[PDB]
Amino acid sequence: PDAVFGDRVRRFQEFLDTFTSYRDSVRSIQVYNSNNAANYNILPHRIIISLDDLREFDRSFWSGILVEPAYFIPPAEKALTDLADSMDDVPHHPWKLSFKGSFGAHALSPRTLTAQHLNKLVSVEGIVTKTSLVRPKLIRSVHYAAKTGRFHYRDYTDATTTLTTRIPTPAIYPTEDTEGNKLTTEYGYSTFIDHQRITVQEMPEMAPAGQLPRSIDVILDDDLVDKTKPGDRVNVVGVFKSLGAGGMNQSNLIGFKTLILGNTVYPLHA
Amino acid sequence: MSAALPSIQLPVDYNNLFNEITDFLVTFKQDKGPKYMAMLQKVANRELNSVIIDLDDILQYQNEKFLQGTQADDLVSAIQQNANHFTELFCRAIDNNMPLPTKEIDYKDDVLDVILNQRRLRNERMLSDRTTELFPPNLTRRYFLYFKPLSQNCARRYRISSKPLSVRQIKGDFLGQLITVRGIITRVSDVKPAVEVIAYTCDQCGYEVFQEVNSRTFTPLSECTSEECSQNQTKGQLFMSTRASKFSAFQECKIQELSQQVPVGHIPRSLNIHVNGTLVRSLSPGDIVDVTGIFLPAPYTGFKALKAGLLTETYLEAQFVRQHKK
Amino acid sequence: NTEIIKSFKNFILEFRLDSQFIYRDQLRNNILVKNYSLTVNMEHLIGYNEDIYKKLSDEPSDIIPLFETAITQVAKRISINSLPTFQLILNSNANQIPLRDLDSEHVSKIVRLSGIIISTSVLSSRATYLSIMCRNCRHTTSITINNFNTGNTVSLPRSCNCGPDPYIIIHESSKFIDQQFLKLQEIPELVPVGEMPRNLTMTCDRYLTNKVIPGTRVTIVGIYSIYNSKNSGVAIRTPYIKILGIQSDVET
């Protein structure tokens, strides 16, 4: 990595004192992970950040997030975890963000999208309409050989990662190290997360004259699984990613499906 | 290797935890002879083939050397994270400390008793007239292993894996542990002969090759690679036989919710369950049961269409069932 | 390709009727509102020069994407950072071609017609300027597509040897536009006494989306083009009209 990450992590270390109330709530998560171990021998790792001190610290970083979020969230991702280690050193894992938001000018209802609002933080609302099912998903695989001792490792991430894009690894089955070995896939020690795609359309009360509704489909991951029933009035915040190939890879009409990689799915009652 | 598939060290080690398994075997005094002597020998006397190891005995054996005598690492909390590597290795301790010629070698109480001797004595007839590959160890077992959880009083004393979780409570992070669920068995299929080891026959060089079997996919071999036929131009054509291999029973079912743990919203769900071993035909649809067993995902199936979320299919192996309305 | 920009770049700067000249006052008032287009009346081309319209009438698919870059070199003589490619919307009135008689001769020719719109579609995304990196070499590049002829006419290359098509699209640095996919039915007063009313399917670009409700009377000026998907014959194509400029009536 560059200095482009380098100064960028350092400025998110000045975000622990001006609004140090966020540094209080990290310990409260570390409280319930100890006192549950005191009864046996629940809380997620998601920190609600108001998008309100960022106007009062740096206007060139607050307007940075709402324009190109694939370059400022993964820096602020790793900056939070090292502060989530140095304060809490007793026990021996993403630590995601939320963005409460103080909702900006990207407050667009799902009828007005897709044109210049790619790669931004939209705040879409509406009525949920499909509610698909839950399946697990592989992230890390730890192999183990018992003829030479040591464990092993394999990262594996899909195109629906946290925010960015990298070289896609179609890792079916990592086996057969540089020896004569029959490697073993340790379950339990590996990691798995949940995955659920729901589709949301616009509200029929704020609709225009008689037409068909236009829906948009949002991916939820790592925390918000089984949060809303179908047929609820839901406000969602995410990043308007757009993945897939538009028929240019298969050497041969329509193309480029769009998704939202949601964070805060926040039920409303109005 | 370096810079790709690196080595992450772990705080849990596996080297020392073979020996404390061996001391949980027949060298045992809490229950004339111990309970693991005669129950092993009764199976060795071909009177049973389903060795049901309990888990509460692991807990009480820990307290016999906990704060008394030497210090040893925990095993019941070691099982509750892995729960699958402690199945092929717990049997690996058994075959050394087990007397084989205790029973008569008489006529048929089970089939493949005379041919396995001919399988075993011809292999030593292969290694007699030479002046070094034998049968694989997972072939020659002739029993099974199981586990039962603990719920009543042993956890209240000093503090798990026996809580009656509903089907909707099963997160994605339990993949690899022991769980206990409840519900209503439906859509149960019949018994079908599966396979776990396969015996070919070269028919010219005689050397029977084998391989291991994994779920729903296995590939047949090429032509013979044994060194008597090969390194020439004449290589034998090998053919599979069914009277020379090990089969087992297999079944499938689906467990819905018990309709008291259902919410007022979402619609009830189901898990797939494979029953492998001698507990076949022990379930019946339309009842209320409490199923235990390890919970591991199904591997990659082909065609690469719905994949890369792997189509994990979240099935659940069975170890012990506890019915209701006896 | 060469110097046909300068024969059009002088047309925007120097066209002038009696006192107040239009295409430097329609280009300036469509930037302050952030509208990013232009409306050329097609009679004013052939009054100024005939050699320009001779090229545009023969081969329109290769010259209208040359006029779109002749506008964006003029809007940097007025504003002085992000100015995209402008869009050209044109309208005229020669003679309507009825929807029934569209032969095999009108392939890639400016054609206007009329009818009633049946249905619309949902919006989509087409790529204009995308960024490519190779998987092994990691040699970055940038392909800028501006022409529109629906499936594939410009694709990824095969080498920067390396493998079959080693190229990946990177989704973090690109630009996208919209498409609309209407359908259009002929007017029932040109009655098919023994026939059913036929229909065609159009496309629309970034600034004509969401303009017309189903059930109106429109007049549509476009390029009658062809595309060859298999979605029933041997070497069979299918017709469709790439709309550039929908002159609806008052909506009423």
Residue numbers in the entry:
A (entry chain 3): 17 to 57, 91 to 141, 151 to 310, 314 to 331
B (entry chain 7): 1 to 31, 59 to 158, 189 to 216, 220 to 386
C (entry chain 5): 24 to 103, 130 to 198, 201 to 211, 235 to 305, 319 to 339
Give sentences from the paper.
Replication in eukaryotes utilizes CMG helicase (Cdc45−Mcm2-7−GINS), leading and lagging strand DNA polymerases (Pol) ε and δ, Pol α-primase, PCNA clamps, the RFC clamp loader, and numerous accessory factors of less defined function. Ctf4 (Chromosome Transmission Fidelity 4) is a homo-trimer (Ctf43) that connects Pol α-primase and CMG helicase. The structures of the C-half of Ctf4 and its human orthologue AND1 reveal a disc-shaped constitutive trimer via the β-propeller domains on the N-terminal face (N-face) with the three C-terminal helical domains interacting with up to three CIP peptides on the C-face.
To investigate the structural basis underlying the strength of the CMG–Ctf43 complexes, we determined the structure of the 1CMG–Ctf43 complex by cryo-EM to 3.9 Å resolution. In agreement with previous structural studies of CMG, the C-tier AAA+ ring of Mcm2-7 is highly dynamic. Based on the density features, as well as previously reported separate structures of Ctf43 and CMG, we built an atomic model. The overall architecture reveals an extensive interface between the helicase and Ctf43, amounting to 1706 Å2 of buried area, larger than the stable contact between Cdc45 and Mcm2-7 (1182 Å2) and between GINS and Mcm2-7 (1583 Å2), explaining the stability of the CMG–Ctf43 complex. The two major interfaces are between the β-propeller region of Ctf4 and both the Cdc45 subunit of CMG and the Psf2 subunit in the GINS complex of CMG; these interfaces were previously uncharacterized. Furthermore, a loop connecting strands β1 and β2 of Psf2, disordered in the CMG structure in the absence of Ctf43, inserts into two blades of the β-propeller and becomes ordered by forming multiple interactions. The interface between Psf2 and Ctf4 involves H-bonds between Psf2 residues Arg34 and Lys36 with Ctf4 residues Asn850 and Tyr848, respectively, as well as hydrophobic interaction among Ctf4 residues Phe518, Leu770, and Pro771 and Psf2 residues Ile27, Phe28, and Pro29. The previously-identified interaction between Ctf4 and the CIP peptide in the Sld5 subunit of the GINS complex is actually a minor interaction site in which the N-terminal residues 3–15 of Sld5 form a short helix that bundles with the helical domain of Ctf4, primarily via a hydrophobic interface. Therefore the Psf2 and Cdc45 extensive interfaces explain the stable association between Ctf4 and CMG.
